[PDB]
Amino acid sequence: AVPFVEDWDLVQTLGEGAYGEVQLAVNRVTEEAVAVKIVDMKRCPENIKKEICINKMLNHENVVKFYGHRREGNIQYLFLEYCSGGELFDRIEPDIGMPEPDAQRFFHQLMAGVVYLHGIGITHRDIKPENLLLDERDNLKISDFGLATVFRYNNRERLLNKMCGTLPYVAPELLKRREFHAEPVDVWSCGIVLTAMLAGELPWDQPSDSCQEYSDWKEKKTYLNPWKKIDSAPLALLHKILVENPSARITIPDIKKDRWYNKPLKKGAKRP
């Protein structure tokens, strides 16, 4: 009943990569655009079999949609919601950040996605600007579930024990503790993302006692960069998010009650 509408032709590369490359795949009938992550299994299929598996669970407006996959011998093809805006990373001006009302809006949408994930028992484990993509109307989408894992199954939480992620975004308990809860770790990395969006710079290489920028934060020296660029309201949120003890760290329900989070800043859509 559907025409010749599923032959995928590779228009252009959208970039690398690490695991391989991403291409813009159009269908030559509908001109229906999707993105195609191509990975060389030659270059342990558990990293990608789980990535497909987790991707099949996901169905949210702030999470990159999964459309299917392709074996084709030794090369896996992941077909994925195309985000024509690129990465949130490219909207952040070094040393400046972005307008606070844009940052707030991206933050709202990130929380919306992370609540969704945590509600279906999935933790992303690598939230950073590079993995947050933007669609045609500048809506934010969580992307890349290659490090993601189930932390809750049949209403039973599992502790995480392997260290992963990206050092500037990683929470301190994952470098200190053998085992630790998944959700506070995600929350922490959203804190670092917010800091990057409002200041255009990352506060520290890693959240260790051997890191003076990090010790400066525990000591409340908010007269230093990047904190001096921020503004008292979002900074007060950041003081709740970037709390070393994960049991004292603010939870998402409480972030939605925060004063900056609920501050009117930005007028409705440019059109209509």
Ligand X SMILES: OC[C@H](O)CNc1ncnc2[nH]c(-c3ccccc3)c(-c3ccccc3)c12
Binding mask 231-260 for ligand X (x = CB under 6 A): ------------------------------
d(CA 269, CA 272): 7
**Which H helix or E strand runs over 237?**
helix 232-241
- Sole window of 2-10, 75-83, 91-99, 172-180 interacting with ligand X (rule: CB under 6 A): 75-83
Cβ pair 41, 48 in contact under 8 A: yes
**Residue 126 a catalytic site member:** yes
- 144 lies in the binding site for ligand X (CB under 6 A): yes
Contact present, 128 and 171 (Cβ < 8 Å): no
How many Cβ atoms from other residues are within 10 Å of residue 110's Cβ?
A: 22
Rounded to whole angstroms, how far apart are CA atoms 23 and 34? Answer: 9
- Chain centroid to CA 10: how far? 26
Among 22, 58, 117, 160, binds ligand X (CB under 6 A): 22
For ligand X, the binding residues in 172-231 under the rule CB under 6 A are none
Give least dist CB 234 to ligand X, A.
Answer: 27
Total chain residues near ligand X (CB under 6 A): 16
Binding site for ligand X (CB under 6 A): 14-15, 22, 35, 37, 64, 80-84, 86-87, 133, 143-144
The residues assigned a catalytic role are: 126
* Numbered residues of the known binding site for ATP: 14-22, 37
